[PDB]
């Protein structure tokens, strides 16, 4: 199921991330740092539990979850959300809900690259990761 997503991934392309951050209300000085950061994402499984780490020179996050089971999450920008991650069409779909708002973080594999599509409001950001050995 999820096994092609597992491993260490490095950011190699980003489109419309400023739009996405601004839609979420991230302040301009933070957006400026974030626009120049290249995170590493590490996706590990242990049985039915996935752990997704995001590491950078600015902020780090880590979440653990079972597919299809809601979990509490506090995002990098300090939103307290109700989250669920599911496999849908071969994509890892992460849905966050708070205050009646929603955002999706969708990961899919295309030609061995991991494409992360972030949608909030009308903003749609595409971030591409390449696998580390
Ligand atoms: O993993 C990535 O590339 C990523 F930086 F885009 C990201 F998903 F972490 C993210 F979008 F920045 C995020 F941290 F999750 C965020 F949505 F919470 C926000 F910070 F942008 F507000
Ligand atoms: O700090 C915010 O609000 C932020 F959105 F800018 C941010 F830290 F989440 C980030 F820089 F966008 C981020 F990209 F998610 C990150 F730094 F966490 C990382 F993913 F780069 F690691």
Q: How many CB atoms lie within 10 A of CB 36?
A: 8
Nearest ligand 1 atom to the CA of 59 is 14
Residue nearest to atom 2 of ligand 2 (CA): 77
Ligand 2 lined by 75 (C-beta under 6 Å): no
Q: How far is the CA of 55 from the centre of ligand 2 (A)?
A: 9
Q: 77 C-alpha vs ligand 2 centroid, how far in Å?
A: 7
Residue with tokens 């409001």: 121
Q: Is 79 annotated as a binding residue?
A: no
Could you tell me if the CB of 40 is within 6 A of ligand 2? no
Strands 80-88 and 71-74: antiparallel
Assess if CATH 2.40.128.20 describes domain 7-132: yes
Residues 11 and 128: their CA atoms lie apart, in Å, by 6
Element (H, E) at 8: strand 7-15
Specify the resolution in Å.
Answer: 1.0
Other CB atoms within 10 A of residue 103 CB = 21
Q: Which helix (H) or strand (E) holds 23?
A: helix 17-23
Q: Which tokens go with 89?
A: 């069409």
Per-domain boundaries in the chain: 7-132
Q: Name the β-bridge partners of 26.
A: none
* End-to-end CA separation in angstroms for the chain: 21
């Amino acid at each position: 199921m999820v096994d092609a997503f597992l491993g260490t991934w490095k950011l190699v392309d980003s489109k419309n991330f400023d739009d996405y951050m601004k839609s979420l209300g991230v302040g301009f000085a933070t957006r400026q740092v974030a626009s120049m950061t290249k995170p590493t994402t590490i996706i590990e499984k242990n049985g039915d539990i996935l752990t997704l780490k995001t590491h950078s020179t600015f902020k780090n996050t880590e979440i653990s979850f079972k597919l299809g089971v809601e979990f509490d999450e506090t995002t990098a920008d300090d939103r307290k959300v109700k989250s669920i991650v599911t496999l849908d069409g071969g994509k890892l779909v992460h849905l966050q809900k708070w205050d009646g708002q929603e955002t999706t973080l969708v990961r899919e594999l295309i030609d061995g690259k991991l494409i992360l599509t972030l949608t909030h409001g009308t903003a749609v950001c595409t971030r591409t990761y390449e696998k580390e050995a």
